[PDB]
Write a protein that binds this ligand. Structure first.
Ligand SMILES: Cc1cc2nc3c(=O)[nH]c(=O)nc-3n(C[C@H](O)[C@H](O)[C@H](O)COP(=O)(O)OP(=O)(O)OC[C@H]3O[C@@H](n4cnc5c(N)ncnc54)[C@H](O)[C@@H]3O)c2cc1C
Ligand SMILES: Cc1cc2nc3c(=O)[nH]c(=O)nc-3n(C[C@H](O)[C@H](O)[C@H](O)COP(=O)(O)OP(=O)(O)OC[C@H]3O[C@@H](n4cnc5c(N)ncnc54)[C@H](O)[C@@H]3O)c2cc1C
Ligand SMILES: c1cc(CNCc2ccc3c(c2)OCO3)ccn1
Ligand SMILES: c1cc(CNCc2ccc3c(c2)OCO3)ccn1
Ligand SMILES: c1cc(CNCc2ccc3c(c2)OCO3)ccn1
Lengths: 588, 588
């Protein structure tokens, strides 16, 4: 038990010192390693519950039972007198650098998960390389280090959402006494994009500086795993070579899907292209109904665009469907048009994109509704948001033996291990896990600590909160109402709900009964909160704190006994009382 | 035991029915009471864990042990056959309205707590009167029903705060691509005040309508308790009379203090006057350093005023002083001037307020610093925010026997009972309680339920979260750092902290390292979170949800295992790791 932990910790740590906080001989060894700039993990046996047993068990490796004991890649190096000997004789540097492989860790993929994993491992003395390459889009778009979120995801999407929110702030300012005239103000797309791209560039740079300062080797090259320990790399000059590593972390993420119809790849774009587009999209069709489709259609409409969303079946498949419909009704009331139960058949080119004068082209989109009627309309831009997929055939040779599921994602144990013992996977390509940046960062940092510092904590993937940044934001944590009922039966489920109006909306003359919130609870388990849902401004700020309480097992009684902060939107969660079964109206 | 709960419930309830959910005779009585428009409390005995025991003790009042049983004001009325006898003989209405007093409940004070208590009591058949009178300010300001929060507190203050925040929204919108020129835009005070006062008017009216629809008698008259059950009321016509009630709730609140110096009452104003002031204050001096003083100085500066705050000793006494200093440094950098370690001696009038042309007057303020030097400067408006106090001599006859503390607040047990067994106190006049609107409302609602519906739940006054709506907002829940160190010792306290920058501030070129958060934790109790603090935008929305987790005993490990929502300010709480003891910098 203890002994199986110790063997696993010793075998995979790069450099590790066993010690106690008081021990002055340990302090002498720590001082030598600091002076020679040798990074290492440290385990202070006196701070651990079973430190006595661990100490006895070290002798199975070193034949000694005292501290300090220093190990390098599974080999006992010595006590303090022996380490000082190697230092004094100029032998320590070569001992700590001796390895069967080029690297202790190779990370394939330089995004949210891979960067976090690599930097954390480097802190404990693991010799680390991170590989990142960005395959250009069909029209040639490419970007720098940091992955999907940084370059073509959460960061530019929320900045453009903020640009759209400011249009309503300009409107609201008149009612609060400011002299501006909202009608004579317009928006400049390219000025926005320049500011967004300047911030993204500061993040690209900041990650390169962070890897340099952690002594991580950064290769801007494409990686391919050809055997358990061998990674083939291809250069920007197409030079091919092979590097070896003890542990491998696959963190290569996903890219957007295109439907298989004429004209889609040639004349449409995806979110990969949208966030650096040199011209305003103009009259735009968004095909799809994911959070990506709706977030992009939302800010384009707030920025003055003529926008249509073409919806195959429902909005936000997989989210609470009452909330999804409230999200769509708000967008439709504020300018977004919807072509419901409709699918595209072909895109035709009427005008080529005008790169010189910085203007879009023109397209004809033909499609059909599910009853067979025809759709035909002209747009300047067509954005496909119909899902994302990994392409692990470009990353992972089939003979390595890494098992994939029917969607092409990696099948992992609860500690991220693949079917190949030294190979792990994190982030969007880990099958069945929520596909979010904070999850990938947590999994990558926690994994690096288990590999190289003897940690045991696992990543907890349950009840992870989300926020959809539509024009009215939607935050959630836990089960949808229909999933709770499916799992426990309608008679065991109580739903408390209420409309509400932000105080900021009163003087602004905004809508009375559009914002909404509900708690979905289990009667037979002391009214446990199974899911929390809120539609309103700053919904992500509102939701985050409640995710700690749900993690801890909060009940309806816990919300009732906590006092609200006034005046806020979030305080409405502390006084809920109208149930859905009562039939009483939730309006204010 | 169970029996002394039953006695108190029966003696105090106005009209109460003991029932079971599966009982068709109970349903016949319920339907008769509903048709007769008779409101009542209901105790469904089959949903209480010891409903069997309660059934037995009912016989001690009624000599029967079956269900249903009706009681009115402590007297057993009858089973199903007897109640239906009274109904068809036209005797029921006379029986349910028989009482020793004019009212089951008299509430003195129509504010946050009083209105909540009165409406909740009326839902259980208690015959309720609510008295409210607003004594005018020295310059004659008055307002309508709803209390300090509604008319001259949280509601107008947060709306003028929002008006000030929108100025930075105007500035930010240029960097996000909008074509306005912030430098050519001005603010109109009187347009703001009209919008703010129109919302307050809709609240005044809403409360009058709510009372009518709950059958609550509203008297706009000044009340005075002269004996345990007798309340003397004075008319708008100065007509005096007496009414009697069984239970009394004191809920009369506080009003601003003035310093005892020449000119203060005559020529200064307070927050009571500010929110309906017909003219812009102009160059303004705010005297004091409480949350009221700083919130007012803050939005006046954001609206373009020339604003000075005179501080006697420190900012935000009783709040975490590291956070108070960060709050004040932000306002000093954004244009509020501070006269530190200073106190006023007299206000001299130079120019009378011009009611005609809607202009302030002009004043000369004389004061001195603690080192002896002198202060002398002219201002158009002087606002005093040097605390608030009750005036219970105006409310309570000394002979009634209600004990007050040395500050003039009412001394209560943990169920709000005074030293006079039928008189209770709630809200700001209850000694030692946090003086907050949601606290008053919960105290009032919970008390009404104990008096008239047999409830037992008490109000929990511990760890109530707060937010100060300064230009950069400050949210808190639990102990300050210095209070935790004093209570437990420096060696048992660990503080995790970090600066942060909102994503929205990047493209707007706002400051890198002014927003800040920390967790104050107890080492020897599994790193329990004792206090949470955050300085940043939307701080009330950020803080609220964590108050539920802190109520449930959150530890640092609970915050670490919960995953963040990205991109948000609040997510920075889920990955804190820099300790104060380590000396590592908290900057980004
Ligand atoms: C439009 C959009 C908006 C989003 N908004 C949010 C949001 O608000 N909040 C949120 O939590 N999540 C959001 N997400 C999800 C978030 O972007 C992902 O969950 C996260 O970025 C995935 O991290 P990752 O490390 O798994 O992969 P990635 O971040 O995609 O990084 C993988 C990297 O590896 C590179 N790579 C691939 N193959 C190779 C190879 N063979 N060799 C070398 N390098 C390779 C890729 O080019 C890429 O740079 C959004 C996603 C999108 C598309
Ligand atoms: C400037 C300011 C800002 C504030 N901001 C906030 C905030 O953001 N959040 C928050 O939670 N709290 C805030 N507060 C505090 C909040 O307003 C109070 O805690 C709350 O109003 C207390 O309610 P109450 O029922 O005890 O008294 P009140 O709301 O003051 O109501 C008592 C009422 O009784 C009346 N009355 C008095 N004597 C008599 C009598 N003899 N007969 C009849 N009627 C009488 C009074 O005139 C008044 O109408 C703020 C306070 C101020 C001054
Ligand atoms: C598909 C794609 C490739 C090209 N990837 C290597 C590469 C090419 C260009 C680069 C780069 C890396 O860094 C900067 O520019 C090879 C084989 N199959
Ligand atoms: C698995 C492992 C064990 C031994 N304790 C592990 C441990 C816990 C916390 C740690 C650590 C190591 O290094 C840094 O923090 C016993 C049974 N099963
Ligand atoms: C006209 C004006 C008002 C405003 N307050 C009147 C008033 C004046 C003095 C009072 C009072 C009430 O109770 C005790 O003394 C209400 C209704 N009608």
């Amino acid at each position: 038990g203890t002994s199986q932990w110790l063997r696993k910790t010793v075998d995979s740590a790069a450099v590790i010192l066993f010690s106690k906080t008081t021990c002055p001989y340990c302090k002498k060894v720590k001082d030598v390693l600091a002076e020679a700039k040798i990074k290492h993990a440290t385990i202070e046996l006196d701070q651990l519950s079973n430190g006595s047993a661990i100490q006895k068990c070290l002798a199975s490796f070193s034949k000694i039972e005292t501290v300090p004991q220093m190990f390098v890649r599974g080999k006992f190096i010595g006590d303090s007198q022996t380490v000082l000997k190697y230092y004094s004789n100029d032998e320590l540097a070569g001992i700590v650098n001796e390895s069967k492989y080029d690297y202790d860790l190779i990370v394939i993929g330089g995004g949210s998960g891979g960067l976090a994993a690599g930097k954390e491992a480097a802190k404990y003395g693991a010799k680390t390389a991170v590989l990142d390459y960005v395959e250009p889009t069909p029209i040639g778009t490419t970007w720098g280090l940091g992955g999907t979120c940084v370059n073509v995801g959460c960061i530019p999407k929320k900045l453009m959402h903020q640009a759209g929110l400011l249009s309503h702030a300009l409107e609201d300012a008149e009612h609060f006494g400011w002299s501006l005239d909202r009608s004579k103000i317009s928006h400049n797309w390219s000025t926005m994009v320049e500011g967004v791209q300047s911030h993204i560039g500061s993040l690209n740079w900041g990650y390169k500086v962070a890897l340099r300062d952690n002594q991580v080797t950064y290769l801007n090259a494409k990686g391919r795993l050809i055997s358990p320990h061998e990674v083939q790399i291809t250069d920007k000059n197409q030079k091919v070579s092979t590097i070896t590593g003890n542990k491998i972390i696959l963190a290569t993420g996903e890219r957007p899907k295109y439907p298989e119809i004429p004209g889609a790849v040639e004349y449409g774009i995806t979110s990969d292209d949208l966030f650096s587009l040199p011209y305003f999209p103009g009259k735009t069709l968004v095909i799809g109904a994911s959070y990506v489709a709706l977030e992009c259609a939302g800010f384009l409409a707030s920025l003055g665009g003529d926008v249509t969303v073409m919806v195959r079946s429902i909005l936000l498949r997989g989210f609470d469907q009452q909330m999804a419909e409230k999200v769509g009704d708000y967008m439709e009331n504020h300018g977004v048009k919807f072509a419901k139960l409709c699918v595209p058949d072909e895109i035709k080119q009427l005008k080529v994109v005008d790169t010189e004068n910085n203007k879009p082209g023109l397209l004809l989109v033909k499609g059909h509704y599910t009853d067979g009627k025809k759709f035909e309309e002209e747009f300047e831009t067509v954005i496909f948001a119909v899902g994302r997929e990994p392409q692990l055939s470009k990353v992972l040779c089939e003979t390595v033996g890494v098992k994939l599921d029917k969607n092409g994602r990696v099948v992992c144990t609860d500690d991220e291990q693949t079917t190949v013992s030294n190979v792990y996977a994190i982030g969007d390509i880990n099958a069945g896990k929520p596909q979010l940046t904070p999850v990938a960062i947590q999994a990558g940092r926690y994994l690096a600590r288990r590999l190289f510092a003897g940690a045991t904590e696992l990543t907890d993937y349950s009840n992870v909160a989300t926020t959809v940044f539509t024009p009215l934001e939607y935050g959630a944590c836990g089960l949808s109402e229909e999933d709770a009922i499916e799992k426990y039966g309608d008679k065991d489920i109580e739903v408390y709900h209420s409309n509400f109006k932000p105080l900021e909306w009163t003087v602004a003359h905004r809508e009375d009964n559009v914002c909404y919130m509900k708690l979905v609870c289990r009667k037979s388990d002391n009214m446990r909160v199974l899911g929390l849902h809120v539609l309103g401004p700053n919904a992500g700020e509102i939701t985050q704190g409640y995710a700690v309480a749900i993690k801890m097992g909060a009940t309806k009684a816990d919300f009732d006994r906590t006092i609200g902060i006034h005046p806020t939107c979030s305080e409405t969660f502390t006084t809920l009382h109208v149930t859905k079964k009562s039939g009483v109206s939730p309006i204010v």
